[PDB]
Design a protein around this ligand. Structure first.
Ligand SMILES: OC[C@H]1O[C@H](O[C@H]2[C@H](O)[C@@H](O)[C@@H](O[C@H]3[C@H](O)[C@@H](O)[C@@H](O[C@H]4[C@H](O)[C@@H](O)[C@@H](O[C@H]5[C@H](O)[C@@H](O)[C@@H](O[C@H]6[C@H](O)[C@@H](O)[C@@H](O)O[C@@H]6CO)O[C@@H]5CO)O[C@@H]4CO)O[C@@H]3CO)O[C@@H]2CO)[C@H](O)[C@@H](O)[C@@H]1O
Ligand SMILES: OC[C@H]1O[C@H](O[C@H]2[C@H](O)[C@@H](O)[C@@H](O[C@H]3[C@H](O)[C@@H](O)[C@@H](O[C@H]4[C@H](O)[C@@H](O)[C@@H](O[C@H]5[C@H](O)[C@@H](O)[C@@H](O[C@H]6[C@H](O)[C@@H](O)[C@@H](O)O[C@@H]6CO)O[C@@H]5CO)O[C@@H]4CO)O[C@@H]3CO)O[C@@H]2CO)[C@H](O)[C@@H](O)[C@@H]1O
Ligand SMILES: OC[C@H]1O[C@H](O[C@H]2[C@H](O)[C@@H](O)[C@@H](O)O[C@@H]2CO)[C@H](O)[C@@H](O)[C@@H]1O
Ligand SMILES: OC[C@H]1O[C@H](O[C@H]2[C@H](O)[C@@H](O)[C@@H](O)O[C@@H]2CO)[C@H](O)[C@@H](O)[C@@H]1O
Lengths: 660, 660
């Protein structure tokens, strides 16, 4: 009735309600506590199996004891997409009990009894191994028959052919089965990729006069190489749907729209079309299909903004009206967040006609899926029912499992981290409003930590957020945030124009871009900026190449912070369990002054003893240096705001430093 | 479905496999995280119901939001022994949504629409309240259907008359019910009581010559008043069973036993009897019944050592030999811990004849339960199968639920704390080997929050443990540990002779009492020590009185440590959620020197603002003083090694100072 106890198993999420998250080729660490009566030794074997794909022959991996007694650790690396299962099985290994006990008493060294007990072990042990190589067992099983010196037949106890033999085929006693938990593996882009947010309309390129010109998918596609050139793996496009014509918004959040103004893309829908139609000015849907294929040619993928909202002109406003929250006087209520108003849209109502709306939205998501779009940016997901997301998310991947979702949830923790739990492959974070060494240090450790179920996407900016620190610290700071986002997380992102050092907010104390891109056409000339040397495009490229270069940067779990005695300096390191690759990042939070300090290292964390000395190389500088536990470091902006340092590869003791 | 989200419920143990622990009249704090779509407000109601006894119509308590968004906290206080159940139910309260939304918009200040929506709510709400006082809502509902002032029907919202009944009877929408978890409540002695350990035989009192004399229950009962006099609630007796005559141990763990020597009581069993018989030299079983009844007259309870072990001459050795571990040569193995030998006892074998041993031991426990013994100190339980204890425990408590078990498990955490999870009402701890300011600090804080499954019993000493710090720091230290034990835990204990300052170890570097009572008979003359002023009995008495006096000391959860800028000084405070009682303890760890420092307080923890100044009284000294956030303290041993301070009672905001 449960003789051997198994508890505090990890990774488990919400006590097993939600599966943990991992990706292909990621080392997944498993741990559990196994114990039994007295001083009889115990061991556990971790059993992993890969099932179907769904969502709502065993493989055996041996587990190893560790620092803390009775807690056993293991790892496994999943090789195909779908839903995996693991469980921990616990058993008592008498051989270990017998062996360890015997070595202590042999020291006292007659006693003839314990030896025979061993002798009956290997025989019973032997039945488990096939007659073929079982023959050193009978050597051991016929090892303490006859009287003699102690080192008589222990001689077979100690040689590593039968320790190795017992390893492949073990003597298992009192086997007890553990609980089963599940892991959901996604394609690697779920963890490691870089984002670019661009407006297709802004690819217009001016007219014969000064006036901005509306772009098209065709014009948009011309800018795709340059993006790929910077190393981004995913291109994110704001909604490509028709914009409502009533209450269309003007320049600067103005209530009244000029006849030519475009209005914000998130005001989805018009007499012209719904969520399933391309806004005609961009082109026919074939042009889009053509646009996707261009990106695909460059190694990139396309992600569309998915905003479950409607403009008044949206066909649903006419076709299906049960889907909204209707006021008492027959008017239809504008989407609302008190007392501020976003007048150009309608909130959906998920309670009046649930299976009605559910099936239609699924149809729509499926539409774009059929057109090569396999990454969606769910918009303001926290203002829609959770169970819906749990359903919609689970529903799409089961027919096709390579579709991934990103949650734009700027919301308090319980909701933000909560949403991740229900299936979102990625989530936005509070990253932008973390700017002090202490916010960032705890934040870095925080990310993650939550890796078993949350993978964060760190965005340096979004059309709605230009943090104050970018406003007054000048072009230097833009580098700093880029270094932080790119290094802290495998997944990071950027909004267009960031590369131009766009740092002007509409008015002081606001976080909205002046002459915001949501309401106006803004073609930009990146090439000229490059020529006059006022673009951060080369640097970002160098940042993006480096992450791809070092697989250490694709890890969530292994971030570790090292001590630097300067409030303005931040130093942390990441490593890869697989290749042993190891990297240390040192950045300044001060854009303005040269800063110097003494850097102290936790050598154990890098896999070396404290007195060691080793050589490092700076991937930006190319400089090589000799280092030890304590090293001198000085950072000078207007030369380089950060040092990305390559460190000696962590020995094949990588696996235990990943533990927990 | 679940339409509304419920997560991170606490207190839950091992994801619900094991019930949490609590006792009667203890405030049990419950917390959970509840959230839903958008800015619509949400609330939760905690539903508690009391089930039967067993082990392996509703009452409703409203839950309140707090500092951290979306996490709701609640409490309930169980009033009868048995198994309780609780679950969290989640719902959306539209009024709150409507109310909070309207107040923000009212400042903008026509609005003609929102008011009717409220008005259709309050009416929909009226359906929930029972014919009679239902009506001012309809009054509130029809006071703006009429056009008018904005402030006109806010009138009917404004009034504290309308926050009302709705708290008592609420309008609940989209109600979703949470998972169910269980709590097992024991009698209060499970948490709060003090222990005294005595050898019945040591109550012998010499003969006409100098020679010590073996005692009896009769003689043992003579020492019971003085024990009660010191305030102890439980008397713990080493096994009272017959001691084996074969391989019986001599003075000082000597291998050979003299003819008169008594042997260790844990060497259970002889030709005279087994576990079901009283050792005859102590008396007839009636004498025991008389002794137990005697203690109960004094307000005490009797606790017997439950040691699953056998001497060679034990009846089981012949009667049932399947129950033992028989060697290959037919001998049966002596108790063993490699390479140490415990020649006087036999380990049991729980695998050969499981239902065989299970059934005898349960019978044995029931024998003594029938004789008024409802507390057992299970001996070295970690050297017996886990599942067994889980079985034995659930089996005993269902017939009689007032039987409680204490686990002497000096074992690594996973096992020690693990064992507590299975049902052990109390557990021994690592307390004796914590002697530095940081260790005691960590240990005290550590007590919590494991309160949900572990209640620690802090023993200053046992026959097996005479700590080094006691060895050289003189009688002063003995006070210090007593203060630490009594204050840190609601439940604490003492082994006989401690009060006489017995401080001599067998050899330097050992933790065993010289001329140990386990192997030798040791009568003591407590009275003479009193006259000659070398007894810590008065002080201990004052300590136990103080504990009973302040109910704050019966709490596990609320211990909090305050900063004192001295490495030799330790200051912590406890309070009682019920009466608001609050107490602060300051103790010194150096027995030899006067020590002084500046004591800093976190007033918020004590329920006061930082600037407040207030009056306190020292329960040992008796005089009143005035204090503030920072106060001067100096401690002089050889007058008093600690200050136990009565502090201003925590206001009726105790409950919120308890969250999580
Ligand atoms: O060439 C690179 C550089 O060029 C441009 O800067 C030029 C600039 O136009 C010119 O006027 C001049 O500027 C002065 C500057 O006005 C002075 O204020 C002086 O800055 C010092 C400053 O007054 C100090 O307060 C000091 O504060 C530091 C902190 O010590 C740091 O901790 C850090 O604060 C961070 C903080 O730790 C966090 O907790 C969080 O709050 O976030 C903060 C990040 O801002 O940084 C602040 C401010 O840096 O720092 C300075 C001294 O250490 O410096 C100039 C006097 O020479 O200098 C430039 C001409 O060479 C362009 O604006 C820059 O973007 C570009 O990087
Ligand atoms: O009369 C009442 C009094 O009588 C007895 O004590 C007398 C004692 O027999 C007598 O010898 C004398 O004591 C002397 C002592 O011999 C000297 O050694 C000296 O003691 C100082 C000591 O050398 C210092 O190292 C200093 O150490 C403190 C630490 O500062 C504390 O941090 C603390 O250490 C704890 C530590 O923090 C933890 O990490 C952990 O390791 O546990 C430690 C606790 O053991 O305690 C030690 C010492 O307690 O403390 C002394 C500085 O004054 O000077 C002494 C006299 O100046 O004095 C006594 C009477 O004459 C009887 O044993 C006492 O119980 C009784 O109160
Ligand atoms: O849809 C028009 C509206 O867009 C923005 O408002 C939302 C929108 O859902 C997303 O862009 C997302 O970022 O959140 C925004 C704020 O909740 C604009 O902020 C707003 O000016 C515009 O009317
Ligand atoms: O049980 C008697 C036997 O062991 C003793 O030690 C005991 C101790 O008394 C108990 O607390 C029990 O739980 O386990 C201990 C074993 O380490 C004596 O130390 C020993 O001499 C005696 O033979």
């Amino acid at each position: 009735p449960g003789r051997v106890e198994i508890d505090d198993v990890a990774p488990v999420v919400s006590c097993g309600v939600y599966p943990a998250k991992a990706v292909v080729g990621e080392v997944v660490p498993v741990s559990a506590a196994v114990w039994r009566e007295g001083h009889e030794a115990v061991a556990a074997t971790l059993v992993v199996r890969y099932l179907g794909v769904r969502y709502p022959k065993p493989l055996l991996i041996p587990m190893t004891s560790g620092q803390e007694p009775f807690v056993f650790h293991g790892q496994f690396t999943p090789d195909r997409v779908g839903l995996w299962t693991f469980r921990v099985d616990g058993w008592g290994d008498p051989i270990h009990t017998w062996r360890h006990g015997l070595i202590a008493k042999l020291d006292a060294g007659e006693l003839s009894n314990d030896l025979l007990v061993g002798a009956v072990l290997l025989e019973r042990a032997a039945t488990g191994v096939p007659r073929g190589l079982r023959d050193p067992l009978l050597a051991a099983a016929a090892a303490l028959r006859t009287p003699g010196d102690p080192v008589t037949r222990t001689a077979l106890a100690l040689t590593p052919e039968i320790e190795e033999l017992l390893a492949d085929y073990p003597l298992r006693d009192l086997v007890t089965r553990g609980e089963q938990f599940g892991v959901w593996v996604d394609r690697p882009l779920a963890r490691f990729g870089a984002w670019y947010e661009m407006f297709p309309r802004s690819t217009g390129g001016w007219d014969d006069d000064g006036n901005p010109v509306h772009g098209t998918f065709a014009t948009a596609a011309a800018e795709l190489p340059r993006i790929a050139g910077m190393g981004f793996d995913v291109v994110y496009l704001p909604p490509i749907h028709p914009i409502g014509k009533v209450h269309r918004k003007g320049r600067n959040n103005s209530p009244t729209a000029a006849p030519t103004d475009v209005g914000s893309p998130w005001a989805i829908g018009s007499d012209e079309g719904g969520h399933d139609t391309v806004h005609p000015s961009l082109g026919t849907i074939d042009d889009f299909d053509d646009f996707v294929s261009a990106a695909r040619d460059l190694g990139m993928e396309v992600a569309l903004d998915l905003a479950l909202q409607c403009a008044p002109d949206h066909p649903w406003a006419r076709e299906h009206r049960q889907w909204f929250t209707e006021l008492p006087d027959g008017t239809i209520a504008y989407a609302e967040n008190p007392p501020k108003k976003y007048q150009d849209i309608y909130p959906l109502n998920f309670d009046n006609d649930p299976e009605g709306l559910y099936d239609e939205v699924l149809r729509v998501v499926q539409h774009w899926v059929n057109h090569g779009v396999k990454f969606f940016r769910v918009d303001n997901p926290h203002t829609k029912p959770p169970n819906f997301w749990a359903w919609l998310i689970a529903q799409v991947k089961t027919v096709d499992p390579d579709v991934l979702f990103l949650s734009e949830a700027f919301t308090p923790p319980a909701r933000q981290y909560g949403l991740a739990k229900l299936g979102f492959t990625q989530s936005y974070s509070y990253f932008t409003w973390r700017t002090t060494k202490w916010e960032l240090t705890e934040f870095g450790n925080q990310i993650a930590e939550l890796a078993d179920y949350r993978r964060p996407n760190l965005f340096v900016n979004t059309p709605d957020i230009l943090h104050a620190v970018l406003q007054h610290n000048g072009p230097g700071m833009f580098a700093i945030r880029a270094v932080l986002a790119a290094t802290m997380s495998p997944a990071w992102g950027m909004y267009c124009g960031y590369e131009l050092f766009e740092h002007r907010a509409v008015r002081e104390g606001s976080e909205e871009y002046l002459d915001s891109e949501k309401y106006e056409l803004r073609p930009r000339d990146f090439a000229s900026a490059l020529d006059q040397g006022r673009s951060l495009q080369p640097f970002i490229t160098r940042l993006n190449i480096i992450r791809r270069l070092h697989p250490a940067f694709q890890q969530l779990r292994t971030i570790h912070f090292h001590h630097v005695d300067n409030d303005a300096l931040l130093a942390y390191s990441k490593f890869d369990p697989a290749t042993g690759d190891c990297v240390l990042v040192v950045v300044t939070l001060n854009a303005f002054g040269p800063e110097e300090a003494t850097l102290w290292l936790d050598m154990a964390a890098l896999g070396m003893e404290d007195y060691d000395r080793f050589w490092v190389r700076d991937e930006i500088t190319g400089e090589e240096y000799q280092w030890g536990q304590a090293n001198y470091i000085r950072i000078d902006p207007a030369r380089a705001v950060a040092h990305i340092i390559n460190m000696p590869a962590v020995p094949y003791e990588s696996r235990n430093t990943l533990l927990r």
